[PDB]
């Protein structure tokens, strides 16, 4: 297999500077004449837009801010200058030898000032309890960076089955993220305990931001 190690995994850039994603291969992707590595952009939802093929050839319409470079094993994409609509995942792909393997991706996110999360917990609705269901949602909105940890605590204990976590992409108005964590229990179970806590651990704080309710 030729294995391509893209790096870094994520890249935080300020608007207007350049960005450099490299992609390294275990063996040459060349014909000792032309080089078969290709660069993709994918904004969530879109299909992969090819940007550059055979190391350096920029596709038509692709803005010449993207430059491609390299051969045999080591390649580089430069986005210079990084405009706001360049935020995405980029993939490199060799197609020299089959199997045609792809790089794992690099996420180019905008940078901003650190922001801690506004957490909220919400008890289950009466409606859900009426059904004998019990979910406890804790939304932990608007924060930067993306790195955060969610711990649920039922009566001083870490219950961590039934937890569904989902995160948004980087908000394009304030380059923030957000996450919802949901603890699902059954009414029998939920009526058997009093404190429900979620505690969002994140760089901007020294101690777990703790948000909890009793009954």
């Amino acid at each position: 297999d030729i294995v391509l190690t893209q790096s870094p995994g994520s890249l935080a850039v300020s608007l207007g500077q350049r960005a450099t994603i490299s992609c390294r291969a275990s063996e040459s992707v060349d014909d000792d004449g032309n080089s078969f590595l290709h660069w993709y952009q994918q904004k969530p939802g879109q299909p992969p837009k090819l940007l550059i093929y055979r190391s350096s050839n920029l596709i038509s319409g692709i803005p010449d801010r993207f430059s491609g470079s390299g051969s045999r094993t080591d390649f580089t994409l430069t986005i210079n200058p990084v405009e706001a609509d360049d935020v995405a995942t980029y993939y490199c792909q060799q197609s020299n030898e089959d199997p045609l393997t792809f790089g794992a991706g690099t996420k180019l996110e905008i940078k901003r000032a650190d922001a801690a999360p506004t957490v909220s917990i919400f008890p289950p609705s009466s409606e859900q309890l009426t059904s004998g269901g019990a979910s406890v949602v804790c939304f932990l909105n608007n924060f930067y960076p993306k790195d955060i940890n969610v711990k649920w605590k039922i009566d001083g204990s870490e219950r961590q089955n039934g937890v569904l976590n989902s995160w948004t992409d980087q908000d394009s108005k304030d380059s923030t993220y957000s996450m919802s964590s949901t603890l699902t229990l059954t009414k029998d179970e939920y009526e058997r305990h009093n404190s429900y806590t979620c505690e969002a651990t994140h760089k901007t704080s020294t101690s777990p931001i703790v948000k909890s309710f009793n009954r």
């Binding site: 290709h38 993709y40 299909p47 992969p48 837009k49 090819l50 093929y53 993939y91 792909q93 197609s95 089959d98 199997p99 045609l100 393997t101 792809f102 794992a104 991706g105 506004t118 909220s120 917990i121 919400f122 008890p123 289950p124 609705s125 409606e127 859900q128 059904s131 269901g133 979910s135 949602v137 939304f139 909105n141 569904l164 976590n165 989902s166 995160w167 948004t168 957000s178 996450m179 919802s180 949901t182 309710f213």
Partner: protein, 215 residues
């Protein structure tokens, strides 16, 4: 210039065969060096290469799945096809038909594999546990639970309120999807004027609106 369109089945249950179809215009599968590939991107992740057929009838496969794959070309109809036999849950992906392995990507076609069947969701309200005056903020939520197939169309106050909404992604828990959205408005806003979650599930013609009301 070239048109590559992929056609395939919507939802497939497990156990079955997936028949995909690439129809191409612009190029001939006759040309020396020519070929088509099938690539798929699993739901939320990397791109994976499936198979490749050439001009000279030669076929090349992804060494892990080759036991369940077969590409064939109808050059009289300008079609190539891929057949994956015995689909289970993990072949939920978007299949793309791709010219000589990288140069022109068609649109994709989204295959969902599931035993599950069209179940309308449940809209549950989330009004604040609240500990007021630690902001003149307030976040409210709406958890949509248990629906299939995707998608739902969620709004707030029939799309009158759009800033400071955050609609999280649908995560399929046990065959079935869940999804929440938080809306965050100032204290002057709620409860002074009402907030309503709107969910509609076109796969069931379910259209529900839940007023978020104080506890």
């Amino acid at each position: 210039q070239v048109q590559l369109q992929e056609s395939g089945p919507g939802i497939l249950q497990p156990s079955q065969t997936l028949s995909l179809t690439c129809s191409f215009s612009g190029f001939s599968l006759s040309t020396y060096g020519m070929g088509v590939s099938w690539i798929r991107q699993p739901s939320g992740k990397g791109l994976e290469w499936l198979a490749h057929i050439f001009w000279d009838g030669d076929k090349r496969y992804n060494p892990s799945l080759k036991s369940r794959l077969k590409i064939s070309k109808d050059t009289s109809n300008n079609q190539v096809f891929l057949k994956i036999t015995s689909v289970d849950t993990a072949d939920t992906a978007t299949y793309y038909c791709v010219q000589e392995g990288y140069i022109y990507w068609g649109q994709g076609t989204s295959v969902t594999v599931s035993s599950a069947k069209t179940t309308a969701p449940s809209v549950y309200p989330l009004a604040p546990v609240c500990g007021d005056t630690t902001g003149s903020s307030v976040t409210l939520g709406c958890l949509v639970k248990g629906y299939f197939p995707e998608p739902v169309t969620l709004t707030w106050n029939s799309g009158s309120l759009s800033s400071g909404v955050h609609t999280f992604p649908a995560v399929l828990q046990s065959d079935l999807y869940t999804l929440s959205s938080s809306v965050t408005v100032t204290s002057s806003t709620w409860p002074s004027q009402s907030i309503t979650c709107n969910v509609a599930h076109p796969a069931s013609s379910t259209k529900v609106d839940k007023k978020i009301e104080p506890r």
